[PDB]
C-alpha cells in the first residue's frame, strides 16, 4: 500500500492536501514486526529486579510488539495475544538471592 502511495506522490491521497495523519503515513516507512516480538525481554521487564519478592503469576505479551514512541502502538495486539504463567519455584517460600 505504501509503495502504491509513493508511486502516486501527486494525485492524492499522498498528494493534494492530505489530512495530517495520512501525511505521517505517506512519510512513515513500515517497520519489521517479527523483529519486535520477543518474550524473554518482556519477561525480564515483568519480573522485579529484586528476586526475594514474589514473581508475577502471569505474563501477557501481545503481538505486534512496539515501543511507546512508535506510531504503530495501537496496532499492538492485532494478530492475537499470548499468555504464560510463572514457575511455582519462587512464589512458595524459598531462599533466593543474586549476591551468591
Amino acid at each position: 500500500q505504501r509503495d502504491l502511495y509513493l508511486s502516486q506522490s501527486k494525485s492524492p491521497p499522498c498528494g493534494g492536501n492530505p489530512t495530517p495523519e495520512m501525511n505521517t503515513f505517506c512519510r512513515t516507512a513500515i517497520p519489521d514486526f517479527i523483529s519486535t516480538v520477543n518474550f524473554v525481554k518482556k519477561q525480564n521487564d515483568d519480573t522485579p529486579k529484586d528476586l526475594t519478592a514474589n514473581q508475577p503469576a502471569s505474563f501477557e505479551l501481545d503481538m505486534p510488539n512496539f515501543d511507546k514512541s512508535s506510531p504503530f502502538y495501537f496496532l499492538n495486539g492485532i494478530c492475537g495475544t499470548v499468555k504464560w504463567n510463572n514457575i511455582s519455584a519462587l512464589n512458595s517460600t524459598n531462599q533466593s538471592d543474586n549476591k551468591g
Binding site: 506522490s9 512519510r27 516507512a29 523483529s35 520477543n38 524473554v40 525481554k41 525480564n44 515501543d67 514512541s69
Partner: protein
C-alpha cells in the same frame, strides 16, 4: 548470559527510529530537489515589430 545481550540488541533496535524518521523526511525533501533540478525552462523568442 547471552539473554541480556539479546535484550540490549532489541533495546538498541527499539531506540533506533530517529534514523528512519529523518530518513523519510529528507527523501520527501530530496525528490522535490531532484524534480526542480530536472526542470528546464525553454527559451523564448520575441521578434520585433
Amino acid at each position: 548470559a547471552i539473554l541480556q545481550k539479546q535484550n540490549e540488541q532489541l533495546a538498541e533496535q527499539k531506540y533506533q527510529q530517529e534514523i528512519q524518521q529523518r530518513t523519510s523526511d529528507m527523501l520527501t525533501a530530496a525528490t522535490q530537489l531532484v524534480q526542480d533540478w530536472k526542470q528546464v525552462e525553454t527559451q523564448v523568442y520575441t521578434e520585433g515589430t
